[PDB]
């Protein structure tokens, strides 16, 4: 049993973390006070769920998690939260003044002063780890803390835990809920600095989540609460293999092995189905072939883009609930002839499949219907590069006029770090381009 | 936290400022005695941003009232909500400034300034995490303009990394007041360009036009104008006084509104003008609805922050917004993607239920500054009324300097259109 | 269906259809940013002193 | 108030379409690189599809089908017909074709065909003098009379966002044939005339003898790649006008020659066709205040 430490950074990472950890407790049957009756071993054990939960001699199951933010408003919501008894004070790190949506502020000014403290609380966790695999890092692209401080923490984590894996869950900026005009700046800056430091990153485009929340869940103006509950489901199905008995992706390193042939191209596209509205809890029960076919419909992707116009280099299918291998094979055979699925030449046209018999858990009073079977497909297609392009374009529009740049220079960042990061991205776009056709 | 320290200076500053505290007291549920009588406990959530708490559940406006003559501030003290201000936060002189920037900035102002900063320093010492400062004043006069800007320079020196915000009433040739307004406004604009992060620009010519043409008021008074201003001051501070994600604090607002450091002069707008969604959205974006003279169609918008307030679909608000972004179309810069942001607050202003507030960083404001520049030049070349300034020790060169600083500002706006 | 692993929680298989910065370097870049801030702020205060 | 942008000034058809749109008042043309638009009349090459359908509260339509270049490239069309089971060797309306690159491809296999009348084109008679795509030349074309003159059929096809395949009822024949000058006006023979000829000379109609195969070929080609380029559940919608080029041989068999993704139009047919494009392609997604199309069902 190798442990995993989850690190939640800034508002998005924090609020999403809370939604995820709530779900984990429900999935593992853990009470909001840390008690878990289902657990027969008291004071410890090497069970699968111990990769995410420590155990105190008193029987409290404590998340291997650390929440960090430069403003106390969001962390406090965790302290007064339903699952507050889970966490202890050392896990929640909070500053006084935030990064004001300024990458330079999160990275250089504020970051420098709080980095050691965050590392100490992180070390306190690792110190309780028999065989730490590495870290799961949640954060947004657009925020000053999520972009600026995350990149610094990643740089340090590489130094202090050299032989440990780091995966990200990154929230990609969408103006439909975006709170800042400089998010394209912060995005490129943090992607540039984190790139050589992240083994595998799952981008989630708020545009996609927001749209799914409207179309599938019938919601006029989706809340972060609404978005974060859907995001937590997907994160849950991506992490399920680390928390339950299995053979597919039981280690953080297996994630890069199966999904990332090329180090720099480490952003797999996630697609999820089915998403049903709970208010109408009388719906038709989708089949294995149907939810599988839905993974290739752009409208269920975490990032809106067209996989038909790129190449795959790895594809993993994660099923939850009532599913046997027999049906998956039939569903894949029929879909292959039916849809445009083109792998890179130096890769076998193959699908890795995992099935967890336990059906997806829903939060009570939530917005999602419970379903007897769901699937999350992780696929490394070059099509996701569309996102990088979109983002680089908006960056170029502003930077040509040096708009908002003085805010960054004023924090001690040199202007050269902009053109440095943008060149790195142009290079990245080229890498997808090469692989893509 | 995060607390804002409010400073109001001069006649205009204190009269506009006093009304502002009236309207937002009435929104946070604070009575003229400082007791809370609000129905929703949602008002109390961000109350700390503008109020200190004392014994006996008393809420006291973190505000400093400053003048060089006792007049206006005795009028505040005797006015409604007069007693809610700390007695000790009244700082005033006896000599007056005589509408003279030099007196406000260099002589009479200098004698009073330190004791103003003593009050400022004691209000800040009581802040868990001080956010910055908000100054209300006019530019046309002597105390608000001259001593207001001296204050800003002092504040900056002591609090170098706090946001400095101001609501600044500019003079117009349409509205006759002191003959030396062009001198005072010009000397002040340079101060603002250097030492504030955000300046809301309004002038009485535009507020007059609104009160006259829109509100059908034959002959407007200070009372009528200040009603508009106080309402607009409530709107653009909505995002600071109630829970929300967009423009949460001053620094984040500044980061989203200010592409280039020197261009931080905003034109505010309000709807409905007080004496449907599409109608409400149409007004606030209307040219004849701006709080300053310049026509927004003469330039482009670098950034726009719209705050809707009340109970509304917001589905349609998103619709109406984009209907404006495309109906105008030509008036938004294309090199700042998604430069129009929309915020929404549930609690509507007193007696409206529905409301909107416009905040535009428009290059069209350059006309405002060019106009004042031409006035200043017309006078300065004849050296008319100049002896009131050199009499206080000012050099002619300092005038030539502020003139070209002005033209520089007008030129910088010119680059971006 | 190659590599079919099976347990009480589920099963997994595979279908085939066709065949950096050190601690000092980080510290330096951080401290450099700090120096530039301090310089920028020193220039402001000198200006305010004049 | 709908907004559009033009990114191919070189397009004559959408020059009209832009004229009509503006002439309806309910359409305002934005600056070429303005992100906030409803309809894009996109550029002929490297159209930035990845940036479409990403504007909040804005339904965006584009007049091109991404990926439709497989059916509009010489080497592509061969690769598609000889790969798609929908077509494959079970395709007898498209000439024996092989593709080769200039010094992998099909240069060695083309030989066995020529070895086993062998007039080919890429124009030439013998093989060796051709090396300096290869498709067997229709040595037995359908010569019009009088004049003994060759011709090709041009039909315009409109595929909307719902992927309805519309055949514009007006086609065009783009007119001495030596086995082994202009002036009909402008070498253009419209359907009413060509139908009359085929009736007098050959005792058949344009509909029976040629149009049936045309419609067949249209349906088959576009239906083949429909799963690759449809925008049914895409975050943006697209339509596109196609120019199919056919040839008719001696025994009235229709052959597919070309597929043009940026076709022009016969001058008389410009107004009527572009108007239809607006009505069927643009106004159908963006409403306003008899049919010139034959929809091939599927
Ligand atoms: C088109 C028209 C706008 C233009 O011809 C013009 O300049 N009119 C001046 C006339 C004027 C000039 C100077 C001046 C006042 C008025 C002035 C005034 C009038 C009094 F009876 C007693 C004191 C004062 N102080 C003010 O000083 C004033 O000006 C305007 N409002 C007020 C005022 N309102 C109040 C009530 O709150 C007191 O004073 C308004 C106002 C600033 C527009 C609200 N100004 C005027 O009416
Ligand atoms: N999906 C999702 N997105 C969020 C959430 N909170 C914020 N965001 C997005 O994150 C981006 C803003 O970054 P934040 O996380 O709020 O900023 P931060 O990391 O806290 O850094 P600061 O500037 O110091 O506040 C915007 O694009 C938001 O839309 C959330 O709870 N869920
Ligand atoms: N196999 C074949 N037999 C006889 N004629 C042929 C032929 N292939 C092509 N042609 C002749 O080629 C002419 C049209 O050529 P083609 O369609 O290739 O244009 P093009 O490739 O030069 C550019 P575009 O696609 O825009 O027309 C027709 O008039 C037709 O007679
Ligand atoms: N809107 C508004 N403007 C005012 C008010 N009082 C004065 N002014 C304007 O302010 C300018 C005069 O400056 P003033 O504040 O009176 O002088 P000060 O006391 O030295 O700062 C003129 O342009 C007046 O029109 C007021 O109550 N409301
Ligand atoms: Ca245990
Ligand atoms: Mg924050």
XYZ file of C-alpha atoms and ligand atoms in Angstrom, chain D residues 74 121 135-138 150 152 245 247 257-258 260, ligand 3:
44
model
C -7.030 14.400 -55.775
C -4.271 11.271 -67.892
C -6.505 8.164 -64.037
C -7.535 6.202 -67.127
C -8.688 8.680 -69.758
C -12.284 8.294 -70.958
C -16.750 17.248 -75.256
C -18.520 18.069 -68.251
C -17.840 17.568 -61.695
C -18.515 13.221 -67.212
C -14.232 13.475 -62.056
C -13.748 16.069 -59.318
C -14.669 21.165 -55.517
N -10.432 10.685 -67.114
C -10.755 11.748 -67.892
N -11.167 11.573 -69.167
C -11.493 12.617 -69.952
N -11.436 13.901 -69.554
C -11.037 14.226 -68.300
C -10.667 13.139 -67.379
N -10.317 13.725 -66.220
C -10.451 15.067 -66.382
N -10.885 15.368 -67.619
C -11.133 16.740 -68.137
O -10.639 17.712 -67.213
C -11.496 18.858 -67.197
C -11.620 19.417 -65.784
O -10.391 19.217 -65.086
P -10.338 19.259 -63.476
O -11.737 18.995 -62.968
O -9.202 18.366 -63.039
O -9.945 20.780 -63.109
P -8.562 21.109 -62.348
O -7.959 19.770 -61.685
O -7.588 21.661 -63.317
C -8.872 22.357 -61.071
P -10.615 22.298 -60.575
O -10.841 21.156 -59.664
O -11.003 23.671 -59.830
O -11.542 22.126 -61.880
C -12.843 18.413 -67.748
O -13.265 19.286 -68.802
C -12.622 17.014 -68.289
O -13.001 16.962 -69.667
